[PDB]
Amino acid sequence: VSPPPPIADEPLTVNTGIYLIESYSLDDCAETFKVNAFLSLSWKDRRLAFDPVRSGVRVKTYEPEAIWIPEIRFVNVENARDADVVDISVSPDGTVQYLERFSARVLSPLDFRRYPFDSQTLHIYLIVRSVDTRNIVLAVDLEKVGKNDDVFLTGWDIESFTAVVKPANFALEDRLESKLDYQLRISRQYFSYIPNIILPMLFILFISWTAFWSTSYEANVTLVVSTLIAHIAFNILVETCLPKTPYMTYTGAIIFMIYLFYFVAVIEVTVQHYLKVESQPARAASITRASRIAFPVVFLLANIILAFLFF
Amino acid sequence: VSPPPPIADEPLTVNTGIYLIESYSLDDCAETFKVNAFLSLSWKDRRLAFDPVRSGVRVKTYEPEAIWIPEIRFVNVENARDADVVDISVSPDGTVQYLERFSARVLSPLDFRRYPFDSQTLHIYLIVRSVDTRNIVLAVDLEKVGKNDDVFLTGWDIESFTAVVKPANFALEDRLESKLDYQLRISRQYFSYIPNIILPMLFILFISWTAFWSTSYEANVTLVVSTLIAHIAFNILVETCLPKTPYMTYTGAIIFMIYLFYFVAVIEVTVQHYLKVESQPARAASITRASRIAFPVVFLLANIILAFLFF
Amino acid sequence: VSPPPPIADEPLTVNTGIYLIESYSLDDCAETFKVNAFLSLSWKDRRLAFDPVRSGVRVKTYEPEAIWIPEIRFVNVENARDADVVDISVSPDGTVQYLERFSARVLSPLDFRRYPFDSQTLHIYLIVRSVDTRNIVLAVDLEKVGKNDDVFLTGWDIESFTAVVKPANFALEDRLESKLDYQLRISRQYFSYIPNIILPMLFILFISWTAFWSTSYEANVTLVVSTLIAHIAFNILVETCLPKTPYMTYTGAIIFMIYLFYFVAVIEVTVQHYLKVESQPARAASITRASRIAFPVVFLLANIILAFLFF
Amino acid sequence: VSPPPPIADEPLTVNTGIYLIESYSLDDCAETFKVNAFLSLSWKDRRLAFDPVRSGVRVKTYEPEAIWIPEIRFVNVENARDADVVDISVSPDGTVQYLERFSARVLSPLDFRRYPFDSQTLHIYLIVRSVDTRNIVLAVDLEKVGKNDDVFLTGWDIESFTAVVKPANFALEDRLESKLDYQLRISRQYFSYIPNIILPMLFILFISWTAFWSTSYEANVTLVVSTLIAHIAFNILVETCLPKTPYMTYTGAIIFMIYLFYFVAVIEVTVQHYLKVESQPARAASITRASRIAFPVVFLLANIILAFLFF
Amino acid sequence: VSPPPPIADEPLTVNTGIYLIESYSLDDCAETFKVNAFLSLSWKDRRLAFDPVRSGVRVKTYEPEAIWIPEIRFVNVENARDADVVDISVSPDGTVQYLERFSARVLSPLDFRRYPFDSQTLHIYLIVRSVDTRNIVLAVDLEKVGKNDDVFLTGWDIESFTAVVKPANFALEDRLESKLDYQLRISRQYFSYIPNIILPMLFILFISWTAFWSTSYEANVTLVVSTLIAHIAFNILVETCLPKTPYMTYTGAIIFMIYLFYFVAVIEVTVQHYLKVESQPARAASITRASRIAFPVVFLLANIILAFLFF
Numbered sequence A, B, C, D, E: 001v002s003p004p005p006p007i008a009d010e011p012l013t014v015n016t017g018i019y020l021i022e023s024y025s026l027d028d029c030a031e032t033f034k035v036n037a038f039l040s041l042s043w044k045d046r047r048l049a050f051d052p053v054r055s056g057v058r059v060k061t062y063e064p065e066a067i068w069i070p071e072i073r074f075v076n077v078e079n080a081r082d083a084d085v086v087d088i089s090v091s092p093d094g095t096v097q098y099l100e101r102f103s104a105r106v107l108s109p110l111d112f113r114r115y116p117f118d119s120q121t122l123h124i125y126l127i128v129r130s131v132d133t134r135n136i137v138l139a140v141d142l143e144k145v146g147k148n149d150d151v152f153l154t155g156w157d158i159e160s161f162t163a164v165v166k167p168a169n170f171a172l173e174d175r176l177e178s179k180l181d182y183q184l185r186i187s188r189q190y191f192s193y194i195p196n197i198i199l200p201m202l203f204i205l206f207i208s209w210t211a212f213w214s215t216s217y218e219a220n221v222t223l224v225v226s227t228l229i230a231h232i233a234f235n236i237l238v239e240t241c242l243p244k245t246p247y248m249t250y251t252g253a254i255i256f257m258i259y260l261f262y263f264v265a266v267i268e269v270t271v272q273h274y275l276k277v278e279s280q281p282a283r284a285a286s287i288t289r290a291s292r293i294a295f296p297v298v299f300l301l302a303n304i305i306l307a308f309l310f311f
């Protein structure tokens, strides 16, 4: 079968709808997520119009092979979606109501700048390519756009699932293409990061600052260097796959700062020891006493600056 | 072929049954489990009724293509099930007995609050979407619901496999959906956690408390900081992928408390040393002596409170 | 097509055979193994019997579609096997000789109690479900059961590949099922565990016992605590994915004992130091001197008890 | 069908085009990348020519089976591509315009010599094998070569996607092969390596150099050996799967140098201590004082030499 | 169709050829490698004979379905090769020339005894099972055996790709099988192991030997025990998945020896300290002085013995 002909020169409108049944496997490192949903399609085919009285039914059911069906695809998918046609209904005026259930792995970039206090807009791009006999344009049927109440993404809060009504019409490979943007907004559940990651990492850093209440060089070396090892080992324990970004992130800046702090603490411990050995205890004592305040104060200030710069 | 028509207006009843053959890959991180089972279906189609005397047969066998079959799907699956039709039998009255063997990856959320002493109810939701001509409703054949004796889930005790008899009937995209809840009750085998994880982790923490029987600051620094490293290294060794939860868990609270305890132990060691150096040994001695009791007592008390709050 | 009818009321016997070509990927954690083999099937169909006089051919070759073939499946597989029909031969009396080459991922539970000195019996369960007209029973053709000489399983010694001749006949989903048990006996190659894992782990433990020849508390703390870190780090290096078991294992008991030994060694080091500081060197000296013998002796004794208890 | 015959002795020209829709999974370890693209093909088959006036149509649409299609394959793919034919249009002169959407895993070697400041040229080799009746030659339509604006490779800057116009024509197994080289130029986003990896690794090395301002052998041993552990632990934390190369790399040379530096620092600490103990403090003091300058200077010089040799 | 009949009772010869296009993913742990190659087949089927004058063609082209094709399989594959048929050419005498491009994961055992200075012979076994009407025998067409110049295996040098001309003909399940051995000779690129693994590991061991130039027990304990931790941590950093072997390997022996050396160094440090404390400094001094030579000498000697025993 070939596409329905226009009455006049008009393009064929395909009314679309996506209804989320399941969302899962949001992979931060791959920048992908898996979706299981309904894809509803609607268009007019006058060749399928009938008289309900002379035919004996109010609705007609067809097998996909029996009628012409627009070839709809997703742009940002890894491999083509897994689809099962659920229903094909034709109304007296020739209106076709198509419904399929599909599953797909969607490629959608993420912004890590505010991780782990970030929000993301996931995109699902629907596309149709025009045929020789006529142009095909996509539209959104808002009554057929939504999500199941029990839809969840582990580690995320689902904000909304909507579609940008106006399609993007453009030329690709010498034909017109009609593209729709379906948007899934999510915000990361940051709660667990506080007791699990941030607080223990700060405790380890605070342990190193005890070296400012000790004049024992051997003990101070153990304090600063062993806490540095504990910090690295803790980071191995707690690490999750985050991809390499061409921009600076909030977490990246803090982590770099923590390393810088271990380094400066070694400098202080080295300087305090050298001055004592070189018969200058007054200088050594005033540097250590200032460090007791300078280290937590500079750390608190830098964090406020970073929090302000990123949020 | 379209669905069988009704006698009066009554909906078509599809009698369901799921029999577990294999259960495997219960992934705590992904909150999924794989299942290999039988799906039995039964309904009556009058258009299939025959005279056994004329036909010379008491039962008729059909290929799926030859007859109308209800489109049954699973709600909480990653991809649509891989199914192999085993048998289709039609009796003289038009009763169809359908049987398939299928494999599916099921998405079912887990409650980690009581991990590793948790129990879970895994769900397998069966669904049917109604058609234009008639409404399709699902029913449970509790007799045809079971599991093979050899069915095992590594690390779990399988309690029961059943279904909630009453289906959930609701509207979705202008059509009725009939949903059945099949429930697989499991409880975690916690035994191994005691010698493998809990006891060695406690031993490492108890080692740090020996610093309260020593006035050597250099030895105490090594004790507390090196045990903190041992704790982290031990946690790397025994870790399993638990996902990040928006709620506090029993294990999460304990682990945080263990870090807090290493931190407070450093504080004590720092304070005891500072008072000795600042010519106050009486204060330093009474703080260390109180710590010998305060540390195990507060630890035992906090654990009882947490165990009470979570169980 | 439909099954061959019986002459008298006798069930149809399907003579089976499995011949191993390749065995691989024995996954201890998943409790699965992959197999590549031949599945030979043989049964009698009188409708296919032909007179060798007015025909021409000695044996007739058929395509799977042309004739009735029993639906044979594996019980303990993840997904249905990938099979390629190699040959279908029909002899004058209607004896059908079927041959396929298949690959499958088999789910077979393992007993870890004696790991790494364990032996396992891997099972491949063949099954047939009976039909409306007649009952189907499985049998073993011993001349068609075996394995290729080159068959190897990395890390294991293949003892034998046999079948339990008597099938297990039972009811399931209102029909008779005939199940055969094919057994692949294997024993773990434990050799490498001795130089790679056991010996270095013992050396690390023996290092901690040197603390009984030293009265230096600072050195003893480093000895016991740093060896505990070395032990944990070594275990991270050599670990393999053994699953969590509801029973105690030989390795599990030894590893727990090693942790207990590090703990008791800290106790001793703590006690020896405390007694010296509390003007009791005689007691401290006799505890350390006894520990020099008590630690290796108790360790040797406990190991003998455990080895006896598990073997 | 067989290929269109030649008018004179000329080969059949197949005009090719590749348009990138998605690029993902650039695996440095496997030296592979996944691609989702359009493959456009164009050639003339005179047997397909028609009269538009008689036919009443200006374009003819065909199913792949109905007409002869050149067998185009990729050389450097893991498996054959997953392709979906989108369009086949025939114009009155017999010009065929073919379009498919495909996904493929491409094997393309990477040069690690300049990692992480490297640039790579990814190759996608298109090939056609000639037939008995006629020679098939590939051509590029650079207009039909491009990429979607949203195409991204995590951690890389996509510079260009082009084709080398001249195909490589050669004999293989007694037939002509026409090969086209499609090139995807990428350059690694090195920014993040500076704060995340290089700077913390240098800080850890600088900590070891503080041993040159201390005469305490116990503190110096801890400084050098504990920083060596911190360096190794840090490398475990921030590391990606680079494959083993038969050539020396920039990163490989630097990392080796860092280990050599830890070794020489131990030598210095050992020598300084030995001379002091052997009543030679003047020598010990001058070696340590020279090391304060020698270590950073030699490190800065060697890095300049390496940077010059590799860039 | 069925196989071509014999003129007399001669077997059917199938001339084979394998031409390597790509080789990749040599997995040491799984003992597998992936291959992308051409499989060329040639045999005579007189039923396909034609007169070039009548047909107007000197060569005929067929689709796989249209003619009888020998069922060729690989013995040592995981699943079955997935091939796409490239060409089928029949000459007037009925000589068929078949060509397919395939991809396959091949299971081929590796000898780790000499790792990482090892060489391997990878095998690809081609097989054909004979039929009732006639025996099928495999042959090698040497003009159709080879590899593309660009063929590479990351981490390996490809020496040669050849076939053992004489097939292995044997009986299996009452039928003849004709097996060919295709051999891919490779040698490991060991270069990178020298700066990346061997040299840093030796440096760490040499650091422990500095304890023989120090009488400080506390410093010596830190030296030997902390280097042991560095060694283990380094091994975690550089480790690759070698499988467990029932035989001793060169690398296995060296690694065991390194652990033994750390153990004996602790013994020495323990003995030296004990003798000093037990008023025997002369003995302690001569043991330490002998160790300065004994440790590097015994290490150099044992390595020479091991290198001789393994090479």
Ligand SMILES: [Cl-]
Residues within 6 Å of the ligand: A072, A073, A074, A077, A079, A080, A081
């Ligand atoms: Cl799609």
Ligand SMILES: [Cl-]
Residues within 6 Å of the ligand: B072, B073, B074, B077, B079, B080, B081
């Ligand atoms: Cl489903």
Ligand SMILES: [Cl-]
Residues within 6 Å of the ligand: C072, C073, C074, C077, C079, C080, C081
């Ligand atoms: Cl199966």
Ligand SMILES: [Cl-]
Residues within 6 Å of the ligand: D072, D073, D074, D077, D079, D080, D081
């Ligand atoms: Cl391809």
Ligand SMILES: [Cl-]
Residues within 6 Å of the ligand: E072, E073, E074, E077, E079, E080, E081
């Ligand atoms: Cl194969």
